[PDB]
């Protein structure tokens, strides 16, 4: 089986000296070794990924790939394995927030170009929503205290917490407007699909995905 | 369904290499094969857990949950599925025999602040009562014969017996001050607590429940 993903999508897939590492490279080998598969790992640009899926130059793939409706029209996908969505992240020392923050002054700190804004502008009463060209930006924002709580995707944030704002961030509430991430197979693959399923049940009773899930996320 | 355990409660479960292993582990996953469940297990500290299973934040649990009266109150209780209480524990070679570490034998050692403690103390009428900080001085103390012998909960004493004891050890009689583990459901869950309650039953009756067992504490 040749499995393709991403070039690199922090933390799901990327390069780590000579091989490669993350949450999608974790759960494929174990669900792989459930099965007895053998199979050759083919890094190459998300672009290329649904094209050489359909074309059968690509027997499954997995690179944090969203299960969306017109993506449904193309591919088949396993299962959802991961539970996307935004995530509400405030100052850790902060004990006065839980996605209750409109008017009693509060402030939402965005980047530019995301489904962050459309939920905000929507969800809640900012006293102010500012919006920045990166989260980077966003996140010296709360950095300092302009922002009371920055909005991004669960990931992101909680991959972040883990690594760099390690310290002094913290996270609340779980994922709002959550997605669900699939395993994408070229159509006509009932079989395998099945047996892909089949193994995610068998990770997830045993305790296999919860421990794999905490390495990289650091949470449940 | 989602199924919580505690993060480690040996041998019931613990965390072997990247999954969880034990008694409890082993014992669920036979009855979800019976009802032919589907499920996700979910380690996490245990006082975390009743009120995990009050606000049905998680379906059932297994955790070595002893059933008491006081707990009844806030959860409801499988059929109980471990005997527990307390075990004499002598050298192999050697012929005390039953609770008689008595009138001229006996000198027991125990841990401080534990149900051995108020059980010798009213029960057994003996030499001394040597009590220690930690039971692994209660090991100790009897590796030597400065101890006649040891009282401790029956699975600590089935399990240091088939592990680290090996041999030198035995243990003579079987549970007193008996109690029984229980699985814990939410309340109003009549119809899947009679269920789990049946798979007992035939777990029971086939022989399944017995293996299981010896698997994990070397007897019946």
Same mark, same amino acid.
């Given at each position: ?7 690199? %999508? ?7 000296? &000579? ?6 490279? =974790? !759960?494929?080998?174990? *669900? ?6 053998? #199979? ?8 290329? *990924? +649904? ?8 027997? !499954? ?5 969203? +299960? ?7 591919? &088949?996908?396993?299962?959802? #394995?991961?539970? $996307? ?10 004990? &006065?927030?839980? $996605?209750?923050?409109?008017? =009693? ?29 990166? *989260? ?16 991004? &995707? ?6 972040? +917490? ?6 002094? %961030?913290?996270?609340?509430?779980? $994922? !709002?407007?959550?997605?669900? #991430?699939? +395993?994408?197979?070229?159509?006509? $693959? ?22 794999? #899930?905490?390495?990289? %996320?650091?949470?449940?």
């Amino acid at each position: 089986l040749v499995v393709a993903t991403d070039t690199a %999508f922090v933390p799901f897939e990327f390069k780590q000296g &000579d091989l490669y590492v993350g949450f999608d490279v =974790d !759960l494929w080998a174990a *669900i792989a070794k459930e099965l007895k598969l053998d #199979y050759e790992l083919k890094p190459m640009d998300f672009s290329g *990924i +649904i094209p050489a899926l359909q074309t059968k130059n690509v027997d !499954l793939a997995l690179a944090g790939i969203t +299960i969306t409706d017109e993506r449904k029209k193309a591919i &088949d996908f396993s299962d959802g #394995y991961y539970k $996307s969505g935004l995530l509400v992240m405030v100052k850790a020392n902060n004990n &006065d927030v839980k $996605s209750v923050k409109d008017l =009693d002054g509060k402030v939402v700190a965005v980047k530019s170009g995301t489904g962050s804004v459309d939920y905000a502008k929507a969800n809640i009463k900012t006293k102010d929503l500012r919006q920045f060209p990166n *989260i980077d930006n966003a996140y010296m924002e709360l950095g300092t205290n302009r922002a009371d709580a920055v909005l991004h &995707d669960t990931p992101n944030i909680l991959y972040f +917490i883990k690594t760099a704002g390690n310290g002094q %961030f913290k996270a609340v509430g779980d $994922s !709002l407007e959550a997605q669900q #991430y699939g +395993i994408a197979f070229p159509k006509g $693959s009932d079989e395998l699909r099945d047996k892909v399923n089949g193994a995610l049940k068998t990770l997830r009773e045993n305790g296999t995905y919860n421990e794999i #899930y905490k390495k990289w %996320f650091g949470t449940e």
